[PDB]
Design a protein around this ligand. Structure first.
Ligand SMILES: Cc1ccc(C(=O)Nc2ccc(S(=O)(=O)O)c3cc(S(=O)(=O)O)cc(S(=O)(=O)O)c23)cc1NC(=O)c1cccc(N)c1
Ligand SMILES: Cc1ccc(C(=O)Nc2ccc(S(=O)(=O)O)c3cc(S(=O)(=O)O)cc(S(=O)(=O)O)c23)cc1NC(=O)c1cccc(N)c1
Ligand SMILES: [Zn+2]
Ligand SMILES: [Zn+2]
Lengths: 63, 898, 114, 106
């Protein structure tokens, strides 16, 4: 769906914010931009492309 | 052989050549409208090449008596260089002709009408004026939204290229008025008799008196011209050395704040024959209409002066032998210099009320802070109060997976269906607060039509005559939520509850009596808001200081509680939509309107772009309930405190102090009521501009033609209040333009044949009024029209309307966007995730909102209430008609028996 | 109850800001006025010792605070410290056109009056 | 904190995307990236590879597939921080390990 990937994007930015991503201005700004774009997306290919790039922020750390 | 006769008079090679705008006042018709031109001949002049130039030779024919009359008045005024050269000659077709020489294509009335009746796609004359006088190239218009102040702020530079021609027109009007007074000529100056080079040419309506005793009438000229003076920034040259654009700016003294003689010199240079008394300091004004009149001149002259001259005026004060910096006054852009009266230069102790006043004002904060140069914004930065800058962020929302899995279990969120997820908690990065603060660049210094505003304020005051108000004591003040914010310095030590518990009733009474003689400038704290939205923009709260909100409650609460308790009025603040209140509101709007349609509009950037003159007007309307309890000086100092506290306040935004240019503050409780006054003001001036710009010769109704003829003379010809005509125009507006106002949201029920004939306002008039009086472009895509009144208004306060059967009669019910209800259910704030009872109250509120969806023809909309009721039943099982787990509880909220 | 606690907090804050402000240049600015009344907006413009410049990109930095000293508000300011939005010290040699997509903009330049 | 991470993964698997499952299953095997996976074409991507079997599964030739997109190698920088050739990787040169790969989008 679209609602499922949008809700998963919200949960992903919540667990990025709990890992203190926002102590990095450059990293936090990129995550906010991807999350905002996913929440305003209309088709599922762009939203999943930005979901790839947002999940790569979480998998760049140690978990 | 007429063509070689006209150039036989004046040696210049000529080429021969419609709807023009006129300011008309006759015994037959009165208005500022576009009329037809039939009796004239225009010949154009050419350059050294065979290319046409802006010189025109207007030759018209007359009888013999007015030919002798024009000649005998032109021979007395010719020596003025502000007069266009006139050639008088007889041509045998013997008919006397009058040939004016080297006029422009357009007059000043064409410029003033084209900017006061703006229409996208019907603006050829404004484009021609902008191209002819080199403000912009022809290709500039191709760009989309070239006219829009918000989406293209380069149009301010384009319009400001026109300001030097307007200043020369003002100078030539003063020269022509001096020439008329020195020759003993009495006449009315109108904008259609002056071209865009500044020359005056029509002398038919002038009469002759003894020389030295001429009186030119210039109320209509100056007052119709006034919005163009700040739109084109016509007094830009007055900040340069010797009023020359080429010369460098005037280096004013930084210590200088008075500028009273400079304001008087500017008034004498540009408005010498304006006959009303101008007070540069509005403390010396006689009433509220005098304050409005003299504050309109101050907003034009304050654009000349350095921006560091405004704000609080500070002075070194010794408390118990210790040097202290305190504010002893204020230099307003609108009100001039205001001094405080209870200024003690030497003090022994510091009482609690004076300590509160000394902690509230920005003098001790900004005098001990560092200098700040913030290149992120264009607003005036005052001082950084800390060594660091705060970058606060907004977290995303807390996803409610239980409700979402329950909703997908019940068959929701299928693709291609009506109800989807559209409302989210948009997260914000570190640059969100200052980029939201940068939207105060949409507030521009705006001069109003003062003769029009002084009539519109008397009509708007008729909408507020049913309420009662006045000052109350501190023991009569009811505080709704004691857990509101306390403004900048006071939020470090508690909420608003601590300052109401600490201060005595006598302390609050003395603080309120201190504000009737002194100005206490305060600081507003702007923070980002953690809220759900459908758009990407950041939301902000504003915390006004406890001093301001305490004395404003004491000044305004009786009137605000009386407005919020009145049913059946125009302002519907405080009327609940429950228990049949939506139906009563809508039956009040369709009062007796005879050919009714419905109509709504929006105000783009209303919190930011609202002019300071209209906010001062709204405050004076709200302060008119104080004729018994307040003197004139007390009411002026209350106005000055409101201007220093919620209008031109200093804003703490991220550890730093800035200057707010104006606009409303979203944390002040008076903001909704001031927005309603502003809304009624814009609607009344849209109706005045619709009625005065209609050709009265083609108005068939004699009552309406007589009404516009009295409307023009009540604006521009009389300076007293015709109290009998204000009642008549208010009754006319109540009959044909019934309104429902709730804080800048509005529906009207208007007579549609009157709107097609141009007798009441339509969407076009609201667009024009917002363009010249608000510096915004209202698009028609956010405005709506509803021709069938069984369907309700398309949207009022984010609520849709349905006509359903309830009992034995058809009742209007309100319903929201179902996507909004599901998004509020699925995404939840942090406090609601902690306690499970708060989730039950949140879902009961959402099921109350979503109950009228069950009566919708769409079954998918109707299932939202059943989903919320089943989830409420589940939440109750994991934990009469007074039981919220049954549909009777939600049916009883929309039935008229309260 | 709370009146005594709020009074102490308000009183201590008023003295703290009072102690921070200089009294030589502040009395020099005030005494040149006729009636002893000056605008508030010129008090940190003329008497402050620190200047904080918040700079959003490199194009503003090369025009506003270039070199080790710059001129603003008719005074000379030598740069003491530059930090980024993450509050870490950025050296002067790091602020070029090359390295500016590695810097966390905005930069907050702290300067002292010469 | 732990509950949200477990909750995020449960829904993430529920979406069942090709690229999301690719990233999660290869990062389960130690093959995590170093920067953000870019979306524009011809952009940088640093990714570590800890095991030779994971190199066999991911890389084949001068190009490899990550997040259901094609990326071709510019140069591989090992733990010795110097350039490793394309044919230099072999099963007997794997004792001769975790080495980062830079690539661009096809
Ligand atoms: C679901 C929902 C959707 C939208 C909104 C909402 O606040 N809309 C807005 C209200 C006010 C303003 S204001 O600050 O300019 O006065 C808004 C401004 C903006 S904007 O200036 O950023 O474009 C946007 C919205 S929005 O519709 O949320 O997109 C604004 C609220 C809700 N919340 C509820 O309906 C709700 C939640 C809990 C209980 C109940 N009974 C109701
Ligand atoms: C339904 C209703 C009922 C009662 C009232 C009412 O009287 N409110 C208040 C009146 C006066 C004051 S005063 O202290 O500044 O004189 C209030 C102050 C405050 S506050 O400054 O302490 O927060 C709050 C309210 S409130 O509306 O009850 O939220 C105040 C308001 C409302 N509000 C509306 O009708 C409304 C207002 C704006 C938008 C919409 N959609 C609806
Ligand atoms: Zn006055
Ligand atoms: Zn009063």
């Amino acid at each position: 769906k679209m609602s499922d990937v949008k809700c998963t994007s919200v949960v992903l930015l919540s667990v990025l914010q709990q890992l203190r991503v926002e102590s990095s201005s450059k990293l936090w700004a990129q995550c906010v931009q991807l999350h905002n774009d996913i929440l305003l997306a209309k088709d599922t290919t762009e939203a999943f492309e930005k979901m790839v790039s947002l999940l790569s922020v979480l998998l760049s750390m140690q978990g | 052989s007429f063509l070689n006769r006209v150039c036989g008079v004046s040696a210049a090679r000529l080429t021969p050549c419609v709807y023009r705008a006129f300011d008309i006042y006759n015994d037959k018709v009165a208005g500022f409208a576009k009329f037809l031109k039939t009796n004239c001949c225009r010949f154009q002049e050419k350059d050294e090449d065979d290319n046409l130039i802006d010189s025109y030779f207007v030759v018209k024919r007359h009888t013999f008596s007015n030919y002798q009359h024009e000649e005998t008045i032109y021979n007395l005024l010719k020596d003025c260089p502000a007069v266009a050269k006139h050639d008088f000659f007889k041509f045998r077709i013997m008919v006397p002709h009058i040939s004016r020489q080297r006029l422009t294509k357009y007059t000043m009335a064409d410029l003033v009408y084209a900017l006061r009746h703006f229409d996208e796609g019907n603006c050829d004359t404004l484009k021609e004026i902008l191209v002819t006088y080199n403000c912009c190239d022809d290709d500039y218009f191709n760009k989309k939204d070239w006219y829009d102040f918000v989406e293209n702020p380069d149009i301010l530079r384009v319009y400001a290229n026109l300001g030097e021609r307007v200043r020369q027109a003002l100078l030539k009007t003063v020269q022509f008025c001096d020439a008329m007074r020195n020759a003993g000529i009495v006449g009315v100056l109108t904008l259609d008799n002056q071209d865009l080079n500044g020359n005056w040419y029509d002398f038919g309506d002038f009469i002759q008196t003894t020389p030295g005793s001429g009186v030119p009438v210039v109320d209509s000229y100056y007052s119709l011209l006034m919005p163009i003076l700040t739109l084109t920034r016509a007094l830009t040259a007055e900040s340069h050395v010797d009023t020359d654009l080429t010369k460098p700016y005037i280096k004013w003294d930084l210590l200088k704040y008075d500028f009273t003689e400079e304001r008087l010199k500017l008034f004498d240079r540009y408005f010498k024959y304006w006959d009303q008394t101008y007070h540069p300091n509005c403390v010396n004004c006689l009433d509220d209409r005098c304050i409005l009149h003299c504050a309109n001149f101050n907003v034009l002259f304050s654009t000349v002066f350095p921006p560091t001259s405004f704000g609080p005026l500070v002075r070194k004060i010794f408390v118990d032998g210790v040097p202290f910096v305190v504010s002893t006054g204020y230099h307003f852009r609108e009100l001039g210099v205001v001094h405080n009266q209870d200024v003690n230069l030497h003090s022994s102790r510091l009482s609690f009320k004076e300590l509160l006043v000394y902690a509230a004002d920005p003098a001790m904060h900004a005098a001990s802070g560092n200098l700040l140069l913030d290149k992120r914004t264009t607003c005036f930065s005052v001082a950084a109060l800390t060594n660091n800058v705060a970058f606060q962020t907004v977290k995303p929302g807390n996803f409610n997976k239980d409700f979402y899995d329950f909703a997908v279990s019940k068959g929701f969120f299928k693709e291609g269906s009506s109800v989807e997820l559209k409302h989210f908690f948009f997260a914000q990065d570190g640059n969100a607060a200052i980029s939201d603060y940068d939207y105060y660049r949409y507030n521009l210094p705006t001069m109003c039509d003062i003769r029009q505003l002084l009539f519109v304020v008397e009509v708007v005051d008729k909408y507020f005559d049913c309420y009662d108000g006045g000052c109350i004591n501190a023991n009569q003040v009811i505080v709704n939520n004691l857990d509101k914010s306390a403004g900048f310095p006071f939020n470090k030590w508690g909420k608003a509850r601590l300052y109401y518990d600490s201060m005595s009733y006598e302390d609050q009474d003395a603080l309120f009596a201190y504000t009737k003689r002194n100005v206490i400038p305060t600081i507003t704290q702007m923070n980002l808001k953690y809220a759900i939205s459908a758009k990407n923009r950041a939301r902000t709260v504003a915390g006004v200081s406890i001093c301001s909100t305490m004395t404003n409650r004491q000044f305004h609460q009786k009137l605000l509680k009386s407005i919020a308790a009145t049913r059946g009025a125009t302002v519907v603040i405080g009327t609940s939509k429950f228990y049949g209140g939506w139906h009563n509101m809508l039956k009040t709007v369709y009062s007796d309107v005879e050919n009714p349609h419905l109509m709504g509009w929006d105000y783009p950037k209303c919190d930011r772009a609202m002019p300071n003159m209209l906010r001062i007007m709204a405050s004076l309307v709200l302060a008119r309930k104080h004729t018994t309890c307040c003197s004139l000086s007390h009411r002026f100092y209350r106005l000055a405190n409101e201007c220093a506290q919620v209008l031109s306040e200093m804003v703490m935004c991220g550890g730093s102090l800035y200057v707010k240019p104006g606009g409303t503050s979203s944390g002040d409780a008076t903001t909704a009521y001031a927005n309603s006054v502003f809304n009624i003001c814009q609607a009344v001036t849209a109706n005045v501009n619709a009625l005065l710009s209609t050709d009265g010769n083609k108005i068939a109704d004699k009552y309406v033609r007589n009404l516009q003829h009295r409307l023009y003379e009540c604006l521009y010809r009389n300076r007293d209040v015709d109290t009998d005509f204000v009642n008549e125009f208010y009754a006319y507006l109540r009959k044909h333009f019934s309104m429902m106002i709730l804080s800048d949201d509005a529906v009207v029920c208007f007579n549609s044949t009157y709107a097609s004939q141009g007798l009441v306002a339509s969407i076009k008039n609201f667009k024009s009024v917002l363009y010249y009086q608000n510096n915004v472009f209202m698009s028609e895509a956010k405005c709506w029209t509803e021709t069938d009144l069984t369907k309700g208004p398309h949207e009022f306060c984010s609520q849709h309307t349905m006509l359903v059967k309830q009992g034995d009669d058809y009742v209007y019910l309100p319903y929201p966007d179902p996507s909004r209800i599901l998004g509020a259910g699925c995404f939840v704030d942090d406090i609601v995730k902690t306690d499970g009872t708060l989730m039950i109250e949140r879902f009961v509120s959402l099921a109350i909102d979503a109950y009228p969806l069950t009566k919708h023809p769409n079954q998918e909309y109707a299932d939202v209430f059943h989903l919320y009721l089943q989830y409420i039943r589940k939440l109750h099982d994991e934990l009469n008609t007074s039981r919220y787990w049954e549909p009777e509880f939600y049916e009883a909220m929309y039935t008229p028996h309260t | 109850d709370k009146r005594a606690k709020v009074t102490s907090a308000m009183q201590t804050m008023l003295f703290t800001m009072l102690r921070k402000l200089d009294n030589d240049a502040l009395n020099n600015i005030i005494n040149n006025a006729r009636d002893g009344c000056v605008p508030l907006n010129i008090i940190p413009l003329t008497t402050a010792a620190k200047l904080m410049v918040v700079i959003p990109d490199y194009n503003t930095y090369k025009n506003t605070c270039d070199g080790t000293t710059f001129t603003y508000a008719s005074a000379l300011w030598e740069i003491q410290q530059v930090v980024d939005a993450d509050s870490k010290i950025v050296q002067l040699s790091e602020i070029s056109m090359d390295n500016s997509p590695n810097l966390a903009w905005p930069l907050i330049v702290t300067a002292l009056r010469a």
